[PDB]
Every structure is written in structure tokens, then in C-alpha cells.
Write a protein that binds this ligand. Structure first.
Ligand SMILES: [Zn+2]
Ligand SMILES: [Zn+2]
Length: 366
């Protein structure tokens, strides 16, 4: 009766695991382990202190067709030219002026008022419904007629991922902007992680929705479910896109957009592992050109956030973040991850970055 899940874990982290678990398979860099669903969260907290990477939930990949067991499936898992330019300055600059910082603060206020937004809880489902209806309200408010919304289910997890699209009938490789809506169990305001990213892209979506521009690509805004369970929701979303043959040009992930290590240092960080090099380089250019704050670089290890799900399928993916890995918000995944830690100018800048990304890339066709 108790649910088991299977996780892919870097060796540096797996060596320090004390909760009960079976090892299904192992190579130089990874173990794949079997744990109780109820123990997964302690692993997240351990991963935070070990700081050598997180994990990926591979439960769904082990039930894949043309396979016998789990241990044999686990062993097979562990075995063995796009140009980006800045060409829409006038349009991007006008759009950036439309961003309303108070909207981000108010969205964030609502999200943190749930006890938590865990993928196994009804409040996790409420969050998804609330985001969906907010998107739909805004589309009506600004008379944008080419939008659509739908849920992507998350297996036995209650909370679905939310997929929204602007330009639903445009047949061209899509631009994707993402964040995750969930938190851990217990009291988890999840303001920094990832209420801030969720709120930043919601306001970016508002600005695109108020636009009268016809783009050359569809633009997706996605709030993934169950990121904290090991990227479960983004894995289902990527699978949905593959099954439905929806081509994707470029993906950006917003996971934590509000914490400044130094309140007067507005530096934005570009993460360089499990991301596309050219697209990451493009993000730095966007920040420099449109946001006019410094750029620095960091790495955050395996299973870091939902961009990794896209990157694993060789889809160009990038990840800007509020801090370096070394200086990250220390109250992450605790009840102290609150709005009072955060900087609204920082969050607004990430929201501006989402809009520039969307406009620049969706306005061009290869
Ligand atoms: Zn996160
Ligand atoms: Zn997290």
C-alpha cells in the first residue's frame, strides 16, 4: 500500500543517504534507488546541505514499454546550429514599460497564503486552478483571442501542470517560458522558491496578452507541477509535447527570482550546466542589453530545475537565477522562505527578461 518511487541520484549525494532504500542500479556517476514516497522530502533537505546536486524522479521511465523488471530497466537507463540575435528593440522596450511590479507582489501574496502548494495536496490543485483562471481572466480583459489553456496530468500526483499558449494555431516551433508552482509538504510559504518565478512569468504573460502583435511562433507559459518531487511535472509536459508532436525552439526556466544576496547588487546569474550554451549566452546578452544590470555565471548540479527535463531531450534550454549557487537563499524549503526576504526590483527584472526573451525569439522564424 505505501507508494514507492524511484530516483536517480548523483553518487556524491547517494553516499550520504541514511533513509531506508534499495539500490536498483549504479554506475560511476549515479545510483538509481527505490524509496518510500514519504521519504523523498528528507532527501531534498539533505541535498540542500550536501550541495553537490539534487535528484530526478525516474519512476515513470522505469514503467516504460518493452521492459521486464525495474532493476533491469534501471540498468539500461544508466548504461554507456541555431542563431540568436537582438532585432526587436523598439517593441521590447515598449513592452518592458508595461510591466507592473505591484501585480507580481500581489500574485506572490496570494501564492504564499496557502499552507503549502505540495503536489500531493488539495492546495496544490487549488494553486493550479487559480493560475489557470487568472490567465484566462487576463486574456478576456485585454481581448487576446488566440489563447488556450490545458492541464497536463502528473500520474498519481493530484496537482497537474498548467500549460497556456498565446497563438494556439501558429504552426511553428514554439517558445516556452516556465516556472514551477509547487512546494514541499509541511508549512511552506515558498515565496522565493518558486512563488517568485511563478509570479514573474505571470506578469510577463499579462504583458504579452495585452499586446496586439501577431508573432511568428506560439508562446507557451507553463507552470509545472511537482518540481520538488524530482522534476515530475516538467517530465510529463515534455512527454506530452513529444506525443502530440509539438515542436519547440527554445525554453527558459524561472526558478527563484527575488532574493538578492546584497540588496544593492542587482546582478543576475546565468546557469551553465544542463543548459544550452548558445541560448545561455543569448540570455546574458538580453540581460545586458535590456535590463542593464551585471551578469555572472554559476552551476547548480544534477536535477536542479525544470529546464533539465527539456535539456535531456536536446531541446535548447536556459536558466537565469536570482543568485549564484554558493550564495543561494538559505531559507529555501523551509517555513522561513517568506516574501520579507525578497526584492521586488529583482523579481521585476526577471519578469522583464521573460518578456524580452518571448518577443525577440517569437518574432523571428528560422
Ligand atoms: Zn524551485
Ligand atoms: Zn526547490
Amino acid at each position: 500500500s505505501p507508494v514507492h518511487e524511484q530516483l536517480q541520484v548523483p553518487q556524491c549525494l547517494a553516499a550520504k543517504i541514511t533513509v531506508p532504500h534499495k539500490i536498483l542500479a549504479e554506475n560511476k556517476e549515479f545510483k538509481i534507488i527505490d524509496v518510500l514516497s514519504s521519504d523523498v522530502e528528507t532527501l531534498t533537505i539533505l541535498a540542500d546541505k550536501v550541495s553537490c546536486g539534487h535528484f530526478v524522479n525516474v519512476s515513470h521511465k522505469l514503467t516504460g514499454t518493452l521492459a521486464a523488471n525495474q532493476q533491469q530497466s534501471a540498468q539500461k537507463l544508466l548504461q554507456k546550429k541555431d542563431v540568436y540575435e537582438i532585432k526587436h528593440e523598439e517593441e521590447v522596450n515598449a513592452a518592458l514599460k508595461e510591466i507592473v511590479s505591484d501585480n507580481i507582489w500581489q500574485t506572490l501574496t496570494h501564492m504564499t497564503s496557502y499552507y503549502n502548494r505540495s503536489a500531493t495536496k488539495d492546495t496544490g490543485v487549488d494553486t493550479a486552478n487559480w493560475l489557470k483562471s487568472k490567465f484566462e481572466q487576463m486574456a478576456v480583459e485585454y481581448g487576446r483571442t488566440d489563447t488556450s489553456t490545458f492541464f497536463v496530468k502528473t500520474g498519481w500526483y493530484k496537482q497537474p501542470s498548467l500549460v497556456t499558449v498565446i497563438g494556439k494555431d501558429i504552426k511553428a516551433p514554439a517558445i516556452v517560458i516556465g516556472a514551477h508552482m509547487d512546494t514541499l509538504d509541511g508549512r511552506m510559504p515558498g515565496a522565493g522558491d518558486d512563488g517568485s518565478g511563478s509570479s514573474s512569468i505571470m506578469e510577463a504573460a499579462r504583458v504579452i496578452l495585452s499586446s496586439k502583435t501577431t508573432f511568428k511562433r506560439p508562446i507557451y507559459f507553463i507552470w509545472y507541477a511537482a518540481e520538488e518531487r524530482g522534476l515530475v511535472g516538467s517530465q510529463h509536459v515534455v512527454q506530452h509535447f513529444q506525443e502530440q508532436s509539438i515542436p519547440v525552439k527554445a525554453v527558459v526556466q524561472f526558478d527563484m527570482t527575488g532574493y538578492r544576496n546584497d540588496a544593492n547588487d542587482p546582478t543576475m546569474w546565468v546557469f551553465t550546466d544542463y543548459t544550452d550554451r548558445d541560448l545561455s549566452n543569448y540570455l546574458a546578452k538580453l540581460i545586458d542589453h535590456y535590463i542593464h544590470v551585471p551578469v555572472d555565471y554559476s552551476r547548480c548540479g544534477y536535477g536542479c530545475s525544470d529546464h533539465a527535463s527539456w535539456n535531456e531531450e536536446d531541446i535548447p534550454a536556459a536558466f537565469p537565477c536570482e543568485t549564484s549557487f554558493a550564495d543561494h537563499n538559505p531559507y529555501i524549503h523551509t517555513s522561513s522562505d517568506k516574501m520579507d526576504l525578497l526584492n521586488l526590483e529583482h523579481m521585476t527584472n526577471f519578469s522583464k527578461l521573460a518578456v524580452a526573451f518571448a518577443i525577440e525569439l517569437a518574432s523571428e522564424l528560422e
